[PDB]
Amino acid sequence: TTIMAVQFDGGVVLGADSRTTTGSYIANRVTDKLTPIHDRIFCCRSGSAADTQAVADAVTYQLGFHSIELNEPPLVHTAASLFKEMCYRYREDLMAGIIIAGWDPQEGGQVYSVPMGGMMVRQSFAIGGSGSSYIYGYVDATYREGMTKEECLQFTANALALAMERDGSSGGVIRLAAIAESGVERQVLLG
Amino acid sequence: NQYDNDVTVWSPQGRIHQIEYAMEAVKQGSATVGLKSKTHAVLVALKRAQSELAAHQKKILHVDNHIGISIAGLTADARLLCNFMRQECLDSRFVFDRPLPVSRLVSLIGSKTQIPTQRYGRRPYGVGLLIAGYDDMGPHIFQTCPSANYFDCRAMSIGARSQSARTYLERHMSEFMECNLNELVKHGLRALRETLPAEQDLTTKNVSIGIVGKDLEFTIYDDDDVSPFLEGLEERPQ
Amino acid sequence: SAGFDRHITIFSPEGRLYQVEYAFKAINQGGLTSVAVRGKDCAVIVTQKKVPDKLLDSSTVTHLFKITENIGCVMTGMTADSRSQVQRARYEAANWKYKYGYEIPVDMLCKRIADISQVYTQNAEMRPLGCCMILIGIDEEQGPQVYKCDPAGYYCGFKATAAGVKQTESTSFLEKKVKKKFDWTFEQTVETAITCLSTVLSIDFKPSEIEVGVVTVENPKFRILTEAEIDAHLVALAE
Amino acid sequence: SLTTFSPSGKLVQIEYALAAVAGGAPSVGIKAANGVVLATEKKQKSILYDERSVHKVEPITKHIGLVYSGMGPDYRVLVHRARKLAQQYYLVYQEPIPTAQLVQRVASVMQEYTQSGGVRPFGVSLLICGWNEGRPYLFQSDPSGAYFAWKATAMGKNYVNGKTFLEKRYNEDLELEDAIHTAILTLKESFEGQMTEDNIEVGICNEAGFRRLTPTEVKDYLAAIA
Amino acid sequence: TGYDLSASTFSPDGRVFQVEYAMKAVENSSTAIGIRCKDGVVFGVEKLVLSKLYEEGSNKRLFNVDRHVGMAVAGLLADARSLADIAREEASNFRSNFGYNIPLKHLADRVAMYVHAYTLYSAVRPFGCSFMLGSYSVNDGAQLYMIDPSGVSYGYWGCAIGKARQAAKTEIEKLQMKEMTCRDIVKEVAKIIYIVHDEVKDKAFELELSWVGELTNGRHEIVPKDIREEAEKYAKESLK
Amino acid sequence: MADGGSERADGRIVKMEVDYSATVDQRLPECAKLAKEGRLQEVIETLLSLEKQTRTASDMVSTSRILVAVVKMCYEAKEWDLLNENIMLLSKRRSQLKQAVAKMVQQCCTYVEEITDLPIKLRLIDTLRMVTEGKIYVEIERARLTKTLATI
């Protein structure tokens, strides 16, 4: 449910809960909610599941085919435009809370947000999910422009901690992802 | 010469002769002359008949409030491109609610006539368009060809024996630019009276004049506002 | 013979068709040579360039086309057929990746490209894409692979592989060379590729004319060598 | 081309495809009492080629074998068609397709390509076999759409000579091993002198199912079988 | 001489004679060259008036495809117009689908596939055009490509299309092409075009010069050639 | 190049006179790449001629003075690598070899008479290469006749 992406100077840092529920019963307790597309670009999803999974698979197809034909590493804004087109074309049928982030060689770390409608915007931080309203309450209080990697990790840790603590649908376990020029760093925290 | 049957075949000298044959089919039309001043564009054509008693086959036809075309060659393709012309005019007149600039219309004419010149199954259009119009920048006199290589000029003339007309246009294209409507039109028929053999003279019923002006709507004339245009002449220098 | 003037793709008497065996030397109008070698856990492509002009560039004369991140290829013959075949290969590899969820093995790709060329051959009113394609790639549980795809749609794949202009001679040298049972310790492969092209063409030239594409089971990514290390291998075989 | 008959004769473009079949690589196939043996003759041109990539003997289901004598590039096409068709039968009836119904439908496909007028026929003759309902079968087809039923036959180079050996050597009653013995005999009659574990490629059809033999047991058996 | 009718058929020696005949169709066309500098690409076309019937400003072979890409066509003009429309359409799809400027390699490959697709089948003929494609980008530099009638598309520093294809590049290649900015290259192309065919077979010609690079900040347009008037005051000094 | 070999030659004229034949090792890639460049007709052949004649002087000072048969094999390996980076199809650049080996077998003439016949016959088995693989020439192989007469 609750997904989060914060950029910093070197790269970006993502994060999500897992706890995919249906109604009042938890169907699955732990989920890879964030999805690799390319080796340097992620997307994290919310809303309905099958919609975002099918969209992410087709975007993975188109983006991999395009970036192999260029024989160059892809852009992040490219993947954001692809998600924008596929979200906007079937807004009558899809429910996507897709948030695009990823480091780029030309443009560094970027974070794009695509909410349930199909608009595309560049932000420095993003929320997402039904239990994101709360950390959206204080993400304009605790955030400071120009963090380090560890400050972003501690920040999103406190964020997703309180989101999992407060919302009934949110919960489960904390997954993090750190994307920079150096590498891709995933980890599983609790606290 | 056994390669010289279809549009698709390139020649071993590279000149597709179906295009040349369509050019020669254009060369057997009636004579017509179009020329512009800085403010008024005038195109004048020549009529013919099947017999004495019958009426004359018309050449200047209307298109739009500021567009009029002359013609030479086939008439089915003439009316086909006429209907397409009127259609594309009223299309942009509907959508953009403005009169069309002439250059994009003639680019659409070239793109229209491109397809029957490249695929198999249509003939190149035997057509002799002389187009007069008004965009924001004044009169334009364009001509086409069956090879769709449309030209812009300041004074052209196509049809049968139209080369003496071109010599007259050479020796008066400097003089064309300054004058008003009346002597401009009589320069046009001082091209048409050399598009004819010398033993007969241009009468009323065989000539046609279409003026479009920067404030004047495109209008065709026949014999009655042409009886004013036919006086003001001398004889040929015999 | 003909007689029938072999204008379309039909069967002539006794018994062949002449369109495809005219397409087999559309490679020969390329004026170009390609050699592939599989000895061991590596695989090496080598192919020269024919650039007479100083106004012409050097990066965009590349024939090694990285199909996917683990599959490379090289092309000979006419250029348009080759590049269109390459984009068909990329599109169908991406189609594999979309449909089946994992990276395509190099065998199925050659099968699919051969089938496309056969459909272009089976139905008439299309030119049969007169270019030849050599592929390389690493597969788990099978090691490296080297394959060849024909304009006819006859794929095959084998140890020491060569196609282009002068490759009766190249396969004569590769029969006279792949008959001794030594191992092929990757510089044995690079040395035998450079020297087989150096005995077929007999030029013994700068490091700036040939292109070397390698793939190895230590880095399964396809890799194109640089002028420095090409020069290093060339003087390493210089005795 | 393919749309009009001759003044008196036959369909010259099908006769030429049959000639291209007869100009192909030899093969032999024998129906015995319990099983059917197929055997081809697969020579590489050089010493460079690998024998694990291209396969002549090819299964259609788990109990239906199929070889050819012609062109692999068309062979694979009509193989894939027969695959999809047999799986469609098994979708419809939930039962493994009988070989007669396979030969009907494959013959319908080949016949549809012999129809007018832009596509060429296949240069492929099949040898279809399978063990349906106890009694095994053997069905040869051709580019013309026709089909037959054999006890033992051959196709390729010197099929006439191999067939005259088959008429003398073979009979009605054998087992699978004696069938393989006479099959490698009649293929060794016409093939080149160097016949190894890779120049031949043999699959059988027991009633327990189709079985495509390995180079291990092929080299064990043809290590001077007589 | 035996079989050169269809564009699908091969020859007894293995080439398509339709493509050769279409290649030497552009040989009779007007001479068009191009050259890039270290911060831009310069076009130049020897254009001829028929006799006295033109208007000096009609049917300009210097098209303008994208915001930073234009053509320098030579050959059959209407086929080049249609191909320019196809190139505008392809740049339109790319701008609509990815939100940034088309790289010239990808554009050239799509155009080469389109030309090759018109060379393939038997219903249609190959194109009778040969054109130039230039570009500039802040992260890519200057790129000048080249498409033959067959569909072979690769890159150059300088080129020539027309009668004097060799006779231009004989003295194109003696230019110190790297160390010059394009504002010198303007009068350089002027002198190169002015060298070939002053009066010999025809009567008179006329010069057009297109212009893209860093000095236009990534734009592509024709020069104000009347501004700095660089041909004639040097063309009259290039006859001696 | 033309100047590319002129520099090497015009410089090394004393680099080996009294200075040791280590500037040779400092000039081996020099002559190597000079031959590699290889002007069509005569220029780089004249350069290589000057180079191999300086090398004949070096033979006089090392292979004809110290007679190590290891410095002889070193000069032969130098020319060997040089011909490894050179076609020599009688391609107007062979004076690097023809008169070089001519003076080499004249050195041999002075050797069998002066040096022990074993080092000179090693030089001879290397001259076997030099001609039998290096496009055997009549008078060079007349020297071969007299050198197998020397083996006699």
From Swiss-Prot, chain B:
InterPro entries annotated for this entry?
Ntn_hydrolases_N, Proteasome_alpha, Proteasome_alpha-type, Proteasome_alpha1, Proteasome_asu_N, Proteasome_sua/b
Q: Which Pfam families match?
A: Proteasome, Proteasome_A_N
Do you know which SMART domains this protein is assigned to?
A: Proteasome_A_N
Provide the transmembrane region boundaries: none
Q: Phosphoserine (modified residue): where? A: 107, 174
Inducing factors: Induced in breast cancer tissue (at protein level). Up-regulated in liver tumor tissues.
Q: Which residues form a coiled coil?
A: none
Instruction: Give the subcellular location.
Output: Cytoplasm; Nucleus
Tell me the first and last residues of the signal peptide: none
Question: In which family does this protein belong, per the annotation?
Answer: Belongs to the peptidase T1A family.
| Summary of subunit composition and partner proteins | The 26S proteasome consists of a 20S proteasome core and two 19S regulatory subunits. The 20S proteasome core is a barrel-shaped complex made of 28 subunits that are arranged in four stacked rings. The two outer rings are each formed by seven alpha subunits, and the two inner rings are formed by seven beta subunits. The proteolytic activity is exerted by three beta-subunits PSMB5, PSMB6 and PSMB7. Interacts with NOTCH3. Interacts with ZFAND1.
- What's the protein here called? Proteasome subunit alpha type-1
What organism does the record attribute this protein to?
A: Homo sapiens (Human)
Swiss-Prot record, chain C:
* Positions bearing Phosphoserine: 12, 58-59
* GO BP, sorted A to Z: positive regulation of canonical NF-kappaB signal transduction; proteasome-mediated ubiquitin-dependent protein catabolic process; proteolysis involved in protein catabolic process; regulation of inflammatory response
Database matches in CDD domains: proteasome_alpha_type_6 (cd03754)
Main subcellular location of this protein, as a coarse class? cytoplasm
GO molecular function, a single term: RNA binding
Sorted alphabetically, the Gene Ontology cellular component annotations on this record are: cilium; cytoplasm; cytosol; extracellular exosome; mitochondrion; myofibril; nuclear matrix; nucleoplasm
Keywords, in A-Z order:
Acetylation, Cytoplasm, Glycoprotein, Nucleus, Phosphoprotein, Proteasome
Note the InterPro entries from the entry. Answer: Ntn_hydrolases_N (IPR029055), Proteasome_alpha (IPR050115), Proteasome_alpha-type (IPR023332), Proteasome_asu_N (IPR000426), Proteasome_sua/b (IPR001353), Proteasome_subunit_alpha6 (IPR034642)
Residue positions where Phosphotyrosine is found in the record = 154
Q: Which PROSITE patterns match?
A: PROTEASOME_ALPHA_1, PROTEASOME_ALPHA_2
The residue stretches assigned to a coiled coil in this entry are: none
**Location within or outside the cell:** Cytoplasm; Nucleus
Q: Which residues carry this modification: N6-acetyllysine?
A: 97, 99
Q: Pfam families, per this entry?
A: Proteasome, Proteasome_A_N
Q: How does it assemble?
A: The 26S proteasome consists of a 20S proteasome core and two 19S regulatory subunits. The 20S proteasome core is a barrel-shaped complex made of 28 subunits that are arranged in four stacked rings. The two outer rings are each formed by seven alpha subunits, and the two inner rings are formed by seven beta subunits. The proteolytic activity is exerted by three beta-subunits PSMB5, PSMB6 and PSMB7. Interacts with ALKBH4.
The family line of this record is: Belongs to the peptidase T1A family.
Q: What is this protein called?
A: Proteasome subunit alpha type-6
From Swiss-Prot, chain D:
Spell out which residues are annotated as carrying Phosphotyrosine: 16, 68, 113
Write out the coiled-coil annotation as residue ranges: none
Query: Which residues are recorded as modified (Phosphoserine)?
Result: 6, 8
Which Pfam families does the record associate with it? Proteasome (PF00227), Proteasome_A_N (PF10584)
Modification N6-acetyllysine, positions:
62, 163
The conditions that induce or repress this protein are given as: Down-regulated by antioxidants BO-653 and probucol. Down-regulated in response to enterovirus 71 (EV71) infection (at protein level).
Mention any one GO cellular component term assigned to this protein in its UniProt record.
proteasome core complex, alpha-subunit complex
Q: Any idea where this protein resides?
A: Cytoplasm; Nucleus
First-listed, main subcellular location of the protein, grouped into a coarse class:
cytoplasm
InterPro entries for this protein:
Ntn_hydrolases_N, Proteasome_alpha, Proteasome_alpha-type, Proteasome_asu_N, Proteasome_sua/b
Gene Ontology biological-process entries: proteasome-mediated ubiquitin-dependent protein catabolic process; response to virus
SUPFAM superfamilies, sorted: N-terminal nucleophile aminohydrolases (Ntn hydrolases)
Q: What's the PTM story here?
A: Phosphorylated on tyrosine residues; which may be important for nuclear import.
Which key words are in the record? Acetylation, Cytoplasm, Nucleus, Phosphoprotein, Proteasome
Q: Name the family.
A: Belongs to the peptidase T1A family.
Q: What does this protein do?
A: Component of the 20S core proteasome complex involved in the proteolytic degradation of most intracellular proteins. This complex plays numerous essential roles within the cell by associating with different regulatory particles. Associated with two 19S regulatory particles, forms the 26S proteasome and thus participates in the ATP-dependent degradation of ubiquitinated proteins.
Q: Quote the NCBIfam families the UniProt record gives.
A: PRK03996.1
UniProt protein name: Proteasome subunit alpha type-2
Organism for this UniProt entry:
Homo sapiens (Human)
Swiss-Prot record, chain E:
Q: Which SUPFAM superfamilies match?
A: N-terminal nucleophile aminohydrolases (Ntn hydrolases) (SSF56235)
In its keyword annotation, does this UniProt entry include Amino-acid biosynthesis? no
Point out residues bearing the modification Phosphoserine.
Answer: 238
MF terms per GO, please?
A: ubiquitin protein ligase binding
Using the record's annotations, give every residue carrying the modification N6-acetyllysine: 52, 201, 225
Q: Which GO terms describe its cellular component?
A: cytoplasm; cytosol; extracellular exosome; nucleoplasm; nucleus; proteasome complex; proteasome core complex; proteasome core complex, alpha-subunit complex
Q: What's any GO biological process attached to this entry?
A: proteasome-mediated ubiquitin-dependent protein catabolic process
Q: What is its main location?
A: cytoplasm
Q: What induces it?
A: Down-regulated by antioxidants BO-653 and probucol. Up-regulated by bacterial lipopolysaccharides (LPS) and TNF.
| Keywords associated with the record | Acetylation, Cytoplasm, Host-virus interaction, Nucleus, Phosphoprotein, Proteasome
Positions of transmembrane segments: none
> Would you say which domain of life the source belongs to?
Eukaryota
Gene3D superfamilies, per database record: Glutamine Phosphoribosylpyrophosphate, subunit 1, domain 1 (3.60.20.10)
Give the SMART domains listed for this entry. Answer: Proteasome_A_N (SM00948)
For this protein, the record's InterPro entries field holds: Ntn_hydrolases_N (IPR029055), Proteasome_alpha (IPR050115), Proteasome_alpha-type (IPR023332), Proteasome_asu_N (IPR000426), Proteasome_sua/b (IPR001353)
Spell out the subcellular localization from the entry: Cytoplasm; Nucleus
Similarity-based family? Belongs to the peptidase T1A family.
Protein task: Component of the 20S core proteasome complex involved in the proteolytic degradation of most intracellular proteins. This complex plays numerous essential roles within the cell by associating with different regulatory particles. Associated with two 19S regulatory particles, forms the 26S proteasome and thus participates in the ATP-dependent degradation of ubiquitinated proteins.
What is the primary gene name for this protein? PSMA3
